[PDB]
Structure formats: structure tokens, C-alpha cells
Amino acid sequence: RALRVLVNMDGVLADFEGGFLRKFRARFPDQPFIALEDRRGFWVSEQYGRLRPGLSEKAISIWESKNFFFELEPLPGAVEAVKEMASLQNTDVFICTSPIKMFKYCPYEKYAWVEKYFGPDFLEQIVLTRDKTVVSADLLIDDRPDITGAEPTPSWEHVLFTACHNQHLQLQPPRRRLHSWADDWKAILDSKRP
Amino acid sequence: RALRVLVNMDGVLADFEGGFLRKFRARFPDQPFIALEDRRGFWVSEQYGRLRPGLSEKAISIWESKNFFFELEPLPGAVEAVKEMASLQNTDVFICTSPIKMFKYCPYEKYAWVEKYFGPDFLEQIVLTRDKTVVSADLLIDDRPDITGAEPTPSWEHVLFTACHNQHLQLQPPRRRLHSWADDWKAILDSKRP
Numbered sequence: 001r002a003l004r005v006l007v008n009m010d011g012v013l014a015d016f017e018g019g020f021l022r023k024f025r026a027r028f029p030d031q032p033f034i035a036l037e038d039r040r041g042f043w044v045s046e047q048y049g050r051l052r053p054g055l056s057e058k059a060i061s062i063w064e065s066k067n068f069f070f071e072l073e074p075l076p077g078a079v080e081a082v083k084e085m086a087s088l089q090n091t092d093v094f095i096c097t098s099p100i101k102m103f104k105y106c107p108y109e110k111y112a113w114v115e116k117y118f119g120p121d122f123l124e125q126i127v128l129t130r131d132k133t134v135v136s137a138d139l140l141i142d143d144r145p146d147i148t149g150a151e152p153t154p155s156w157e158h159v160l161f162t163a164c165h166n167q168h169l170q171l172q173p174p175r176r177r178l179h180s181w182a183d184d185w186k187a188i189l190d191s192k193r194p
Numbered sequence: 195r196a197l198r199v200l201v202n203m204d205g206v207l208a209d210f211e212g213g214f215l216r217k218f219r220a221r222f223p224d225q226p227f228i229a230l231e232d233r234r235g236f237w238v239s240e241q242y243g244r245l246r247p248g249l250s251e252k253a254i255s256i257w258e259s260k261n262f263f264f265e266l267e268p269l270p271g272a273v274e275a276v277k278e279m280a281s282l283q284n285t286d287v288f289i290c291t292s293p294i295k296m297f298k299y300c301p302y303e304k305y306a307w308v309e310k311y312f313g314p315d316f317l318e319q320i321v322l323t324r325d326k327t328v329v330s331a332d333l334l335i336d337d338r339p340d341i342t343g344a345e346p347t348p349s350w351e352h353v354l355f356t357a358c359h360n361q362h363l364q365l366q367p368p369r370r371r372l373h374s375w376a377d378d379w380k381a382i383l384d385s386k387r388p
């Protein structure tokens with residue numbers, strides 16, 4: 001009866017796309033790269049693999065490296081918006097994130113990143129899972145278009161958060177977008193309340 | 195429509211109680227300790243704090259230390275039972291665990307422990323959260339008596355897994371126990387199926 005909102009981390013709170021591109025270019029300066037505006041499809045390494053052989057593996061090595069997740073910059077307005085959202089009456093916010101398969105740094109750095117931008121008390125709001133459909137809530141704000149898993153009927157409405165990779169996608173009505181944290185996330189929340 | 199079962203980690207799959215006691219005694223050999231049979235109440239540091247001042251903090255330092263979670267032994271039958279359970283038709287198993295507040299090692303070591311005993315492919319089945327009520331499923335097998343959080347009506351039935359700390363507790367009917375992994379977990383699963 002508190003409205004419950006799941007907010008994805010990478011591509012919603014944390015600027016994974018920009019951080020990746022920057023780090024890829026510093027480490028592989030004589031390789032071709034995908035400009036952010038040219039990004040298409042969720043999977044970064046797939047697009048890089050299509051661009052040139054061997055490049056999928058180089059791309060992967062960026063996000064597998066120490067400090068990659070920790071050093072991601074917040075997306076504009078993300079921190080302010082989630083902090084306001086969590087302080088709203090009758091509203092519980094969880095940060096829901098799918099860690100990569102290589103687990104040496106990513107889980108740790110995600111907790112550390114949340115501590116840095118939201119504070120120790122916000123660590124209680126983290127959910128790490130590869131399956132978001134088994135987390136129940138009224139809303140999921142997430143930049144991945146296709147969110148599936150073990151539950152064929154999730155309780156949340158998926159609101160697509162705009163990113164380079166999905167900005168041109170035509171969704172099936174009545175699927176809805178949140179265009180950036182400057183867009184009116186409060187009205188989306190209010191539309192789900194009694 | 196696949197039956198979905200959440201299986202807690204510490205005190206259900208991983209022998210947190212035995213591992214803690216062993217490590218506490220090697221590190222603090224001239225301190226009093228709580229024998230496993232004398233354990234009461236979920237919170238280990240609370241009982242240790244009652245036993246002597248300063249001892250809560252020493253207890254905490256054990257599970258905050260590097261390799262504490264990684265080096266926990268599986269509880270008897272736990273690995274075999276969960277592997278069988280996951281291979282059953284129309285049955286999805288997730289391992290659901292609440293990491294401690296100090297996040298340097300615990301998340302990482304939990305993924306590592308799952309990889310060691312269940313294999314890389316089982317990493318997809320991990321859910322880390324401090325709030326289990328927001329994970330939906332038919333069953334939650336968990337040794338903690340009081341499982342609460344943001345969802346006042348969880349979709350799972352909590353089956354209490356026996357541990358030293360809870361073995362004397364009288365539950366409110368119709369709450370049910372799984373007494374150990376030698377006990378008949380298949381009949382509990384079957385009672386929830388259509």
C-alpha cells in the first residue's frame with residue numbers, strides 16, 4: 001500500500017554508456033568505436049563485435065576491469081530524483097541491478113557506488129538479481145526494452161528509461177517511457193497510486 | 195506456473211553458525227562463547243553482547259573478516275537437495291540472501307561460494323536483498339523466524355528451516371518447518387503445486 005518503485009542502476013542511475021566509451025577509447029585508442037548516438041541494441045559487445053572481430057572481447061574487458069562500475073558518473077538528475085522519490089509519502093524505492101557474470105568487483109563496487117551517492121542507509125534498498133520479473137513492485141524504471149525471466153506475469157509496469165541504444169525504438173502501446181530524470185517521473189508514479 | 199522456491203543461504207545452505215563459532219574461538223580463545231546448542235534468537239551478536247560487554251563487537255569482526263563467507267561449509271544435504279530441486283520439472287529455484295552491511299567481501303564471496311558448490315550457471319539464480327518480502331515466489335525456506343519488510347503480504351509461504359537458534363520456537367499454526375535437508379522437502383514443494 002506504499003507504492004513500490006524499482007529503479008535500475010546501469011543506464012538509469014549510472015552512466016554506463018559514457019563510462020564504457022571513455023574507458024574503451026583510453027585503453028584501445030587505435031580501435032574503432034561506437035559513438036553514443038550510434039549505439040543500437042542493449043548489448044554493447046554485440047555491436048562492437050559486428051564492427052570488427054576481436055572487439056567484443058576488448059569491450060567486455062572494460063567492464064570486467066577493477067573500478068569500472070565504481071567510477072561511473074551519475075546520469076543527470078538521477079541522484080536528486082531518486083532521493084526525492086524515496087522521501088515521498090507512501091513510496092518505497094529499491095535500486096534493482098543485474099550484475100555481470102564476472103563477480104570479482106561488480107557487486108562490491110555497486111554497493112560502494114550506492115553508498116557514495118545515496119549514503120549508507122540506502123544500502124538497505126539494493127536488490128541484485130539477474131531476474132527482475134521475480135521482484136514485485138508497482139513500477140520498474142529500466143532502460144532495457146525486453147525484460148523477461150521466470151515470472152511470465154510481473155507485477156510491475158515496465159517504464160522504459162531512454163538511452164542511446166533504445167531512443168529510436170517504437171514500443172507497443174500502452175508501454176510508456178521516462179525520457180530522462182528531467183521528465184515528469186512524479187506523474188508516472190501518481191498514475192499508479194489509488 | 196513453474197513452482198518458484200527461494201532458498202536462503204546463511205543457516206540453510208551455508209553453515210554460518212558453525213563457521214562463526216570456530217573462527218571466533220580460534221581468534222578469541224580466552225573469551226567466553228555460546229555453544230551451538232545454547233544459541234537463541236536470530237542475532238548472534240546480541241547473544242554475545244549479553245554474555246559479556248565488548249563481545250558483540252568481537253563477534254561482528256568475525257563475519258566482517260575476509261574469507262568468512264567464502265570458507266563456510268555447506269550444511270549436510272544442502273547442495274545435493276538444491277541441485278535436485280532445481281532439476282525438477284516445473285520448478286525454479288533462487289538462492290535469496292541478505293548481505294551484511296559491510297560490503298567489501300560478503301557479496302563477492304557469496305557469488306564465489308555459489309560458483310564453488312553449484313557451478314557458474316547457478317550464478318543466474320542469486321538474489322541479494324535485505325528485503326525478502328519484495329521477492330515473489332511460492333515458497334521461502336529460511337531459518338529466520340520473523341521475515342518482514344516493505345511488502346505486508348508476501349506471495350510466498352515461509353517455511354522455517356531449523357537452526358540452533360530457532361529449534362525450540364513454537365510457531366503459530368499453520369506455519370511449517372523444514373527440519374533439515376534430510377527432511378522431506380519434496381512433499382513441501384508438492385503441497386504448493388496445482
Ligand SMILES: Nc1nc2c(ncn2[C@H]2C[C@H](O)[C@@H](COP(=O)(O)O)O2)c(=O)[nH]1
Binds near residue numbers: 008042096100
Ligand atoms: N555480458 C554483457 N553485458 C553487457 C553488455 N552490454 C551491457 N552490458 C551490461 C551493462 C550492465 O552492467 C548490465 C545490465 O544490467 P541492467 O542495467 O541492470 O539491466 O549488462 C554486453 O554486450 N554483454
Ligand SMILES: Nc1nc2c(ncn2[C@H]2C[C@H](O)[C@@H](COP(=O)(O)O)O2)c(=O)[nH]1
Binds near residue numbers: 210237291338
Ligand atoms: N549485523 C548482524 N548480522 C548477523 C547477526 N547474526 C547473524 N547475522 C548475519 C548472518 C547472515 O549473514 C545475515 C542474515 O542473512 P539471512 O540468512 O540471508 O537472513 O545476518 C548479528 O547479530 N548482527
Ligand SMILES: [Mg+2]
Binds near residue numbers: 009143
Ligand atoms: Mg540498465
Ligand SMILES: [Mg+2]
Binds near residue numbers: 203204336337
Ligand atoms: Mg539465514
